[PDB]
Amino acid sequence: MQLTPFLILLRKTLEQLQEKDTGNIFSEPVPLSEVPDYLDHIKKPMDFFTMKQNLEAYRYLNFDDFEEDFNLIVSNCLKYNAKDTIFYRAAVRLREQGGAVLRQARRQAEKM
């Protein structure tokens, strides 16, 4: 497997995942200045901007490490926010819509 086509695929996949987050509520880190208690039980914050930085820092060299950080976006949001909030339901919807995006991307990857 060559690195360049794989990273091209992860760039496209990340774009597709971001497209499912229509509110852009996961686009940037959770602002600790406005959610001061966030790090109390969120041990590894994650967001799409950070994922793009990690991608270009060559920190995703296989599909599972990329998918792991996407799952953190979802799981952190489910953990922090009460079930009856817009945030929690947005994470549920992202988990659902992102799963199809990830399965199709991984099919593409395994063909490489």
Q: CA 65: distance to chain centroid?
A: 11
Q: At closest approach, how far in Å is the CB of 35 from ligand 5JQ? A: 5
Which residues precede gaps in the chain, with C-N > 2.5 A? none
Neighbour count for residue 49 (Cβ, 10 Å): 13
Q: Candidates 20, 52, 54, 87: give the one binding ligand 5JQ (CB under 6 A).
A: 87
Based on the shown chain and the rule CB under 6 A, indicate whether residue 30 belongs to the binding site for ligand 5JQ: yes
Site residue total, ligand 5JQ (CB under 6 A)? 7
**What's the angle, vertex CA 69, arms to CA 68 and CA 74, rounded to 5?**
95
Based on the shown chain and the rule CB under 6 A, indicate whether residue 35 belongs to the binding site for ligand 5JQ: yes
Part in contact with ligand 5JQ (CB under 6 A); list of ranges 10-18, 62-70, 80-88, 93-101: 80-88
Based on the shown chain and the rule CB under 6 A, indicate whether residue 77 belongs to the binding site for ligand 5JQ: yes
Q: Which of 42, 39, 51, 46 is nearest to 14 (CA)?
A: 51
Part in contact with ligand 5JQ (CB under 6 A); list of ranges 8-16, 57-65, 79-87, 92-100: 79-87
Between CA 71 and CA 91 the distance in angstroms is 10
Q: Where do contacts with ligand 5JQ occur on this chain (CB under 6 A)?
A: 25, 30, 35, 77, 80-81, 87
